[PDB]
């Protein structure tokens, strides 16, 4: 015999059925008694979906049960943000639970561009998540193609590309670039990805960024320095030489 479905609790079921009849009534949603219902939804949803040991089969059975109740209900519950502004997407990306990440994307209702209170999008978090297999990297690529890869974080104005380059992650950089990441975006300090790669001596990353059409190696940070300036100050000569040739 094959596996057994995970069912919604009777409490969760009526919480969802109540939301179904109420979702399109702003006097009801914003009422105090309705918050008791929304808290129940939120509590059990994050329980099953946003823990390191969240079971993908359980998240899949929950997703499908929400759909069957209503697509409005599915949309509402998937996009719940906790007190930190974190959705299930944020959490399952950051915990490297990529099977769950795919289940969420396949529902086609996620707001992939929502930034938590710390200022980070799911794409940004993906650039920092561990990826141990090619199948997981494909799921991360699919996430990049769903949302805005060029969004700027609240902290320091950093993009996903800058975070990837900052930890020397060639795999992420290639994926981001393939999904139309803009290499010329500057952070609050005026720095680009190319300048970051140039400071840390990531030669291969520098080549990947210089190869992108429209790469502007003449840009300066707020101290007036270029990528070339920065490479030379850090003692990375081979990069400095590359930078000179491809800007001139």
């Amino acid at each position: 015999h094959m596996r057994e479905r995970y069912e919604l609790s009777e409490k969760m079921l009526s919480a969802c059925n109540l939301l179904k009849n109420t979702i399109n009534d702003p006097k009801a949603l914003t009422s105090k008694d309705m918050r008791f219902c929304l808290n129940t939804l939120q509590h059990e949803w994050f329980r099953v979906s946003s823990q390191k040991s969240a079971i993908p089969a359980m998240v899949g059975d929950y997703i499908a049960a929400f759909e069957a109740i209503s697509p409005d209900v599915l949309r509402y519950v998937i996009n719940l943000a906790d007190g930190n502004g974190n959705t299930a997407l944020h959490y399952s990306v950051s915990h490297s639970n990529f099977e769950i990440v795919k289940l969420l994307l396949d529902a086609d209702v996620c707001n992939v561009d929502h930034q938590n209170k710390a200022g980070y999008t799911p794409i940004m978090l993906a650039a920092l998540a561990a990826v141990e297999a090619e199948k997981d990297m494909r799921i991360v690529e699919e996430l990049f193609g769903c949302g805005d890869v060029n969004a700027k974080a609240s902290q320091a104005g950093q993009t996903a590309l800058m975070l990837a380059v900052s930890h020397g992650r060639i795999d992420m950089v290639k994926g981001l670039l393939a999904c139309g990441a803009d290499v010329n975006i500057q952070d609050d300090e005026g720095s680009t990805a190319l300048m970051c790669a140039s400071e840390h001596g990531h030669v291969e990353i520098v080549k990947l960024l210089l190869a992108q059409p429209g790469c502007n190696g003449h840009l300066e940070d707020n101290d007036g320095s270029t990528a070339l300036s920065i490479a030379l100050e850090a003692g990375h000569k081979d990069i400095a030489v590359l930078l000179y040739a491809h800007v001139n």
Side-chain angles (χ1 to χ4, degrees), residues 13 61 102 113 129 196 203 221:
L13 193 56
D61 291 351
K102 179 104 203 313
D113 309 322
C196 188
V203 183
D221 67 15

Side-chain angles (χ1 to χ4, degrees), residues 77-92:
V77 183
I78 290 312
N79 292 312
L80 284 169
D82 73 346
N84 309 110
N86 285 312
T87 65
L89 189 59
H90 286 87
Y91 284 124
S92 58

Side-chain angles (χ1 to χ4, degrees), residues 6-26 28-29 31 33-34 37-51 53-116 118-131 133 135-154 156-188 190-232 234-239:
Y6 294 89
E7 310 256 82
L8 306 182
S9 70
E10 291 197 85
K11 192 173 181 160
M12 188 60 180
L13 193 56
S14 62
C16 291
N17 181 32
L18 181 50
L19 183 55
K20 176 182 169 154
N21 296 276
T22 281
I23 191 73
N24 303 318
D25 180 355
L29 277 75
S31 76
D33 288 323
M34 190 54 191
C37 172
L38 302 172
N39 291 18
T40 307
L41 286 162
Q42 171 160 297
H43 183 270
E44 279 185 39
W45 169 237
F46 283 99
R47 191 177 72 72
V48 310
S49 73
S50 308
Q51 292 175 337
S53 285
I55 303 172
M58 178 162 42
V59 173
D61 291 351
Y62 274 48
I63 285 164
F66 301 142
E67 174 76 19
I69 292 154
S70 173
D72 294 326
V73 170
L74 180 68
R75 186 183 285 283
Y76 187 90
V77 183
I78 290 312
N79 292 312
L80 284 169
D82 73 346
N84 309 110
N86 285 312
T87 65
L89 189 59
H90 286 87
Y91 284 124
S92 58
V93 167
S94 86
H95 289 148
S96 304
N97 289 342
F98 295 114
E99 181 168 3
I100 287 160
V101 171
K102 179 104 203 313
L103 296 167
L104 293 161
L105 295 184
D106 293 353
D108 198 13
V109 295
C110 275
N111 183 11
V112 173
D113 309 322
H114 178 82
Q115 62 187 4
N116 64 27
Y120 297 84
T121 64
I123 285 173
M124 290 167 189
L125 298 171
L128 305 164
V131 182
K135 66 172 187 191
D136 296 336
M137 190 64 214
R138 285 193 256 94
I139 291 172
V140 172
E141 283 161 353
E142 205 196 318
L143 169 67
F144 294 167
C146 283
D148 188 357
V149 303
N150 293 318
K152 299 189 74 170
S154 303
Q158 284 178 308
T159 61
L161 183 58
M162 294 167 194
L163 294 168
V165 168
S166 184
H167 295 86
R169 301 197 72 181
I170 293 156
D171 58 334
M172 290 293 176
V173 166
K174 292 168 82 83
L176 288 162
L177 291 182
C179 295
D182 184 352
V183 307
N184 297 327
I185 288 168
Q186 287 170 291
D187 72 7
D188 288 2
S191 51
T192 59
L194 184 65
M195 298 171 201
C196 188
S198 297
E199 170 58 38
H200 303 310
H202 301 315
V203 183
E204 284 304 319
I205 290 168
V206 164
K207 293 189 186 165
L208 294 183
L209 300 170
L210 292 171
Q212 279 299 312
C215 191
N216 187 348
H218 302 112
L219 294 173
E220 306 183 321
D221 67 15
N222 295 355
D223 302 322
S225 33
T226 59
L228 176 55
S229 296
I230 284 164
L232 295 160
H236 303 313
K237 288 144 287 192
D238 290 334
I239 290 169

